[PDB]
Amino acid sequence: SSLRPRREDPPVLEEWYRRHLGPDIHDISSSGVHPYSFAEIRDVCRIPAADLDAVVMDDSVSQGGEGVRRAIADRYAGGDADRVLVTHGSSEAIALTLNALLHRGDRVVVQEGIYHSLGHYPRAAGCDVAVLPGRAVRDGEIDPDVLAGLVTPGTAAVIVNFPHNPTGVTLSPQGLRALKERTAATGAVLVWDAATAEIAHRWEVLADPGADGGDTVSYGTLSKTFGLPGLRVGWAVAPKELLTATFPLRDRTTLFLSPLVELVAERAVRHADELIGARAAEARHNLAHLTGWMAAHEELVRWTPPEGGVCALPVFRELERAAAGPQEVERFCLELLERHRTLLVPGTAFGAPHGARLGFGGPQEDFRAGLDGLSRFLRERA
């Protein structure tokens, strides 16, 4: 037969979860907040059974249901619905837009250690790619000298995710303001992933660049801060001109969304503050206990604390002392899972060989035991 499936490697992050995610374990690896039950959702976002039952299971539209597009636009695009594309999670948004945006040849600046599919599509589009290093961003700004060197006239796009999954680095309202001007001046397009935007620790929550009305693309999703990764709804905020040029590709992949799923999402974006607040507040209870845990263990673990989001990237000192290979952290994260029922994401997924993703977005009531698992783990090896 001619059944030869094309061999492409799975991205480290997804394959890790596929292989190891399951029940009977203390999971502290997620870059998002722990999910709500659908019960809770109807209660918080105010959804009667009669409103769901009234939904005709018919075709939605290409750009997204008018109701839910209004809800996102108001919050993120300054009322302009024509500038929102609603997608099957922000993943579909990234795929559709970047496909329509990037050409072969163009110079594109991509944040180091970025979530794959954001660096994946420019790499695929055969773009000329120049890395914006991790160390270049500190104290809520990108070294203006590094910005001058990397983003010059001609440059097609600058792709960044802030707050950063997994490190938890982000920008000050000034830092973003500088970056906007740099890209406005060179003609570059700011591509801006705002997945964990709503949870900020050091500075105030960053206003969406897509709200300006300029030549920028920004993404958002109900999956990280909202506690609805399983609703599968995200968006892109960008010029109508681009969004409509994504339709042909949508026509051979997904077509459109469920008006039922849209109904729900519309109410989630309206009652967003109630949804995020309860989870953010909970996550900081966790952050506090983590910081103490960190200082108690500073002989074995070094870290930069998150300036945003609900996950960090602790670095284990023993992997720096041996120094490579990257395969070690995976063995580490495996042994941690087998002996103590505790999950992290090995840093090989984020170009941080010595690091690992520790997420504190989950339930307070352990949480704690994952740490107590890792604590027991770290002592045994030393």
Ligand X SMILES: Cc1ncc(COP(=O)(O)O)c(C=O)c1O
Q: Which residues are annotated as part of the binding site for pyridoxal 5'-phosphate?
A: 90-91, 115, 165, 221, 223-224, 232
Measured from the CB atom, the residue of 37 and 323 that comes closer to its own copies is 37
Measured from the CB atom, the residue of 91 and 152 that comes closer to Au ion is 91
| Angstrom distance (rounded) from CA 170 to CA 161 | 8
Pairing of strands 128-132, 107-111: parallel
Measured from the CB atom, the residue of 90 and 246 that comes closer to ligand X is 90
Query: Least distance (Å) from Au ion to the CB of residue 11?
Result: 5
Closest among 134, 77, 87, 21 to 261, alpha carbons compared:
87
Query: Least distance (Å) from its own copies to the CB of residue 372?
Result: 24
Radius of gyration of the chain measured on its C-alpha atoms: 21
Q: Is residue 192 within a helix (H) or strand (E), and if so which, with residue range?
A: strand 189-193
The residue nearest ligand X at its CB is 89
Footprint (CB under 5 A) of Au ion, residues 68-97? none
Which tokens go with 251?
């026509």
Query: Least distance (Å) from its own copies to the CB of residue 226?
Result: 9
Residue of 10, 11, 230, 292 interacting with Au ion (CB under 5 A): 11
Pairing of strands 189-193, 216-221: parallel
Query: Least distance (Å) from Au ion to the CB of residue 361?
Result: 22
Measured from the CB atom, the residue of 92 and 112 that comes closer to its own copies is 92
Query: Least distance (Å) from its own copies to the CB of residue 370?
Result: 17
Find which of its own copies, Au ion, ligand X, none residue 1 binds, CB within 5 to 8 Å per kind: its own copies
Q: Which contacts (CB < 8 Å, 24+ apart) does range 8-12 have?
A: 11/116, 11/117, 11/120, 11/349, 12/346, 12/348, 12/349
| Angstrom distance (rounded) from CA 254 to CA 55 | 20
| Angstrom distance (rounded) from CA 6 to CA 318 | 38
Find which of its own copies, Au ion, ligand X, none residue 10 binds, CB within 5 to 8 Å per kind: its own copies
Find which of ligand X, Au ion, its own copies, none residue 234 binds, CB within 5 to 8 Å per kind: ligand X
Place of tokens 């590094």: 146
Closest among 119, 123, 224 to 168, alpha carbons compared:
224
Footprint (CB under 5 A) of Au ion, residues 166-195? none
C-alpha distances in angstroms, 185 versus 118, 130, 148? 23, 19, 11
Find which of ligand X, Au ion, its own copies, none residue 227 binds, CB within 5 to 8 Å per kind: its own copies
Measured from the CB atom, the residue of 117 and 172 that comes closer to its own copies is 117
User: Which residues does 46 contact at the CB level (< 8 Å), separation at least 6?
Assistant: 267, 271
Q: Which residues bind ligand X (CB under 6 A)?
A: 31, 89-91, 115, 161, 165, 193, 195, 221, 223, 229, 234, 255
Find which of Au ion, ligand X, its own copies, none residue 193 binds, CB within 5 to 8 Å per kind: ligand X
Measured from the CB atom, the residue of 115 and 367 that comes closer to ligand X is 115
Which tokens go with 310?
């609900």
190 near 212, Cβ under 8 Å? no
Asked if 99 interacts with Au ion (CB under 5 A), we say no
Residues in the chain: 382
The site map against Au ion for 113-152 (x = CB under 5 A) is: ---xx--x--------------------------------
179 near 143, Cβ under 8 Å? no
Query: Least distance (Å) from ligand X to the CB of residue 29?
Result: 11
Closest among 127, 97, 132 to 113, alpha carbons compared:
132
Residues that bind Au ion (CB under 5 A): 11, 116-117, 120, 252
